[PDB]
Amino acid sequence: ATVLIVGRPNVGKSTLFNKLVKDPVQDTVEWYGKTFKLVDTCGVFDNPQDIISQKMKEVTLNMIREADLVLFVVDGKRGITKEDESLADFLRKSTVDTILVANKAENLREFEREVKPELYSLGFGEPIPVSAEHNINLDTMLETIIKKLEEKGLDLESKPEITDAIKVAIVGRPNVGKSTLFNAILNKERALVSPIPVDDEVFIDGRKYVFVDTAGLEKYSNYRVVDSIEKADVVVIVLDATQGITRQDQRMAGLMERRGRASVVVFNKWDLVVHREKRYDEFTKLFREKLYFIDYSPLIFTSADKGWNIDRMIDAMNLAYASYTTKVPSSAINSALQKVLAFTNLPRGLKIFFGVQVDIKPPTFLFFVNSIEKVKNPQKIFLRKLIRDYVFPFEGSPIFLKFKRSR
Numbered sequence: 001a002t003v004l005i006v007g008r009p010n011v012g013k014s015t016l017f018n019k020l021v022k023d024p025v026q027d028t029v030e031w032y033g034k035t036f037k038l039v040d041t042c043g044v045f046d047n048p049q050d051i052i053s054q055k056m057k058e059v060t061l062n063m064i065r066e067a068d069l070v071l072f073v074v075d076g077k078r079g080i081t082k083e084d085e086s087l088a089d090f091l092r093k094s095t096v097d098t099i100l101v102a103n104k105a106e107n108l109r110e111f112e113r114e115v116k117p118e119l120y121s122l123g124f125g126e127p128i129p130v131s132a133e134h135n136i137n138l139d140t141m142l143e144t145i146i147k148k149l150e151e152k153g154l155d156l157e158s159k160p161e162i163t164d165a166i167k168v169a170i171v172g173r174p175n176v177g178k179s180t181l182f183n184a185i186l187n188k189e190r191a192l193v194s195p196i197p198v199d200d201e202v203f204i205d206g207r208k209y210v211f212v213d214t215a216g217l218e219k220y221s222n223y224r225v226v227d228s229i230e231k232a233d234v235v236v237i238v239l240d241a242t243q244g245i246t247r248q249d250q251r252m253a254g255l256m257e258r259r260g261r262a263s264v265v266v267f268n269k270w271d272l273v274v275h276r277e278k279r280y281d282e283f284t285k286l287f288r289e290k291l292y293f294i295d296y297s298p299l300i301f302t303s304a305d306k307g308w309n310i311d312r313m314i315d316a317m318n319l320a321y322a323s324y325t326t327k328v329p330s331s332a333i334n335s336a337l338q339k340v341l342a343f344t345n346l347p348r349g350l351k352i353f354f355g356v357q358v359d360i361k362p363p364t365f366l367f368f369v370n371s372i373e374k375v376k377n378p379q380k381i382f383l384r385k386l387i388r389d390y391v392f393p394f395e396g397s398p399i400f401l402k403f404k405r406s407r
């Protein structure tokens with residue numbers, strides 16, 4: 001389920017957001033084991049009456065309709081303003097279920113006397129008085145949100161069930177420990193080579209995986225490496241911690257990123273590294289400087305020989321795949337974009353109007369801009385980073401960008 005916080009500037013949306021999720025514009029709220037996604041839409045829907053284009057109005061309406069519920073926040077001390085009225089009109093038009101929340105209403109007696117009456121004119125019934133800053137009545141509001149979501153038949157308890165097998169490729173230079181690592185996985189009770197009558201179907205934790213080109217688990221073509229990367233969803237690149245990161249490792253990483261595969265980076269033979277426990281920062285910096293191409297990848301320190309961190313490697317593959325298949329609300333993408341652009345000046349005459357996610361495997365976003373030629377590498381790095389920083393980290397997954405010229 002997804003809940004959107006809507007409201008004009010300075011009504012306390014950020015404070016309310018931070019209080020509910022316990023800065024990003026999207027996060028999760030937990031309630032007695034039940035959860036839902038929360039999005040502070042910031043100013044994405046401000047001045048809706050100023051949208052001239054019918055297409056743009058329809059796109060904006062679809063953004064709000066992504067929500068199962070909207071928390072329409074107004075200022076309980078100041079009262080109704082023209083901006084609250086325009087937002088109210090847009091929300092009513094959208095027909096999306098909405099809860100009117102009057103923040104800054106700690107002084108209940110004054111609120112009901114001076115402001116509550118006028119709030120009825122917004123068309124959403126009686127407002128729920130709360131105080132995000134003083135943590136007042138937030139529990140009653142939450143209970144109300146949960147009830148409404150459940151009444152709509154939404155499941156706030158079960159985590160989405162995966163249907164496809166997760167294809168994994170284990171790659172790396174000869175002798176780094178690929179074969180040993182693959183067998184280390186198979187030796188654990190949580191894994192099992194499918195008993196059901198060049199790949200291997202493997203079950204781990206009750207989930208289905210396909211480890212590609214397992215036959216291997218002088219060199220000239222490396223056709224298997226390229227083929228394996230293409231076939232996989234998640235690619236585990238294994239490095240020999242005693243050797244560091246070679247140029248060939250960098251080439252494989254570049255290939256992984258260009259093909260848009262999820263990934264996990266493993267420093268194996270960690271047991272052979274001297275004074276190893278005092279060198280995590282050193283190796284992490286090496287990973288960041290040599291493999292920045294795929295720095296979104298979890299970095300696991302393993303010993304395939306001693307059986308160190310095989311579990312962390314498996315969990316990392318699961319996390320990478322989860323990010324690889326994650327979809328985020330367009331309201332969140334645009335809320336983040338507008339929040340950052342507020343204090344960011346784009347070069348040349350570049351303008352980035354809005355964006356939306358258009359695919360997964362890998363997560364791919366389309367941004368509408370005034371000029372495609374004005375979008376250079378720094379702006380692409382900038383867009384991927386704001387998504388990771390404010391929307392969802394997408395740990396383990398690359399983020400692809402597409403652009404469309406518009407006026």
Ligand SMILES: Nc1nc2c(ncn2[C@@H]2O[C@H](COP(=O)(O)OP(=O)(O)O)[C@@H](O)[C@H]2O)c(=O)[nH]1
Nearest residue numbers: 174175176177178179180268269270303304305
């Ligand atoms: N000390 C140590 N030896 C390892 C480790 N992983 C693999 N090895 C050894 O190093 C060699 C390379 O292993 P291999 O698994 O055949 O990797 P491959 O060519 O990547 O598939 C073998 O002699 C292994 O026993 C590790 O984590 N620690």
